Design a protein around this ligand. Structure first.
Ligand SMILES: Nc1ncnc2c1ncn2[C@@H]1O[C@H](COP(=O)(O)OP(=O)(O)OC[C@H]2O[C@H](O)[C@H](O)[C@@H]2O)[C@@H](O)[C@H]1O
Ligand SMILES: O=c1c(O)c(-c2ccc(O)c(O)c2)oc2cc(O)cc(O)c12
Ligand SMILES: [Zn+2]
Length: 299
């Protein structure tokens, strides 16, 4: 067993050790709340509780490939409102940038498309955008698959014109991953390689409520420590009919057999602060936030 004790202090004791060379960051929507962007499943503030005006039979419809193909207007409506684009990466995003600078970051797997991992200074090679990107767009026909650049989507969304392939006249959507779609190839190729050599899973701002991304915690070695920094406990529950996770594929924080998994409950910003400090990196993180935020105001 690699953790001297199931607390934040014993994770930072582990990170200082020789034995901790390669960290995989698994992140979700809660790393981007403190920078102004609401998540999906939080009650009342979550996007899923704020789609009434589309009179959707249920909220996940707006990001489902079959609902989309029949009623594409709801989604295109949201996508403009989705992207004001005036958002700064949080403390939590820089912490991952620090991991990069410390030679500690094997990868960050993100469920977000708000692009703040990239604006925080992680590179395309440090990053798997698990759930796609707005950067490019494609025709939804499997035989055509025509690609259109950021501008071409941008210009049809604020036209208020439902985008349509020039070649086949089918719907064109941004390369965000909808329910029913494939995840990009980079996800599997990186996965099969990355999880063979991982020493710490750091899991931030996610409810682990979708597959395949919720599988990732089960892919690390049985002895790899797994720290959650989240408002609630995520990945830990009694089985039920319709659970998302595999049998015994989840976190064990609290049971008598618990050995390697730690939950820190609270703000993603403050945990990252409290780990940095333990690790003696407080000022270094604060200074890089202060600088990088000044640097954006000015550009
Ligand atoms: N500041 C905060 N600090 C810590 N945790 C936070 C904070 N704010 C929110 N949380 C927690 O952060 C978590 C947010 O969970 P969810 O909103 O489901 O986001 P996803 O990223 O998992 O959604 C995954 C996919 O589902 C979608 O369809 C798309 O396809 C997404 O890509 C909760 O447990 C919050 O308590
Ligand atoms: O909207 C849907 C939905 O909510 C559920 C579902 C999931 C878990 C549960 O516990 C439950 O009661 C329902 O399944 C679905 C299956 C589909 O093929 C299409 C859908 O649109 C839904
Ligand atoms: Zn086409």
């Amino acid at each position: 067993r690699l953790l001297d004790e199931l607390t934040l202090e014993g994770v930072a004791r582990y990170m200082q050790s020789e034995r901790c060379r390669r960290v995989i960051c698994l992140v979700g929507a809660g790393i981007s709340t403190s920078a102004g962007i609401p998540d999906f499943r939080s009650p009342s503030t979550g996007l899923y509780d704020n789609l009434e005006k589309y009179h959707l039979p249920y909220p996940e419809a707006i990001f489902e490939i079959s609902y989309f193909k029949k009623h594409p207007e709801p989604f295109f409506a949201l996508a403009k409102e989705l992207y004001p684009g005036q958002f700064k990466p949080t403390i939590c995003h820089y912490f991952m940038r620090l991991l990069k600078d410390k030679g500690l970051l094997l990868r960050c797997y993100t469920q977000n498309i708000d692009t703040l991992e990239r604006i925080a200074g992680l590179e395309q090679e440090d990053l798997v955008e698990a759930h796609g990107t707005f950067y490019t767009s494609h025709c939804v026909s499997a035989s055509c698959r025509h690609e259109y650049p950021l501008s071409w989507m941008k210009e049809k969304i604020f036209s208020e014109v439902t985008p349509k392939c020039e070649d086949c006249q089918s719907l064109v959507k941004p390369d965000i991953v909808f329910f029913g779609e494939s995840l990009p190839a980079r996800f599997f190729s990186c996965m099969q390689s990355d999880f063979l050599k991982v020493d710490l899973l750091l899991v931030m701002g996610t409810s682990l409520q979708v597959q395949p991304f919720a599988s990732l915690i089960s892919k690390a070695p049985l002895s790899t420590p797994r720290l959650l920094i989240n408002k609630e406990k995520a990945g830990q529950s009694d089985p039920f009919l319709g659970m998302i996770m595999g049998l015994g594929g989840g976190m064990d924080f609290d049971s008598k057999k618990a050995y390697r998994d730690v939950a820190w409950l609270g703000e993603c910003d403050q945990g990252c602060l409290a780990l940095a400090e333990l690790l003696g990196w407080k000022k270094e993180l604060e200074d890089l936030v202060r600088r990088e935020h000044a640097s954006i105001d000015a550009q």
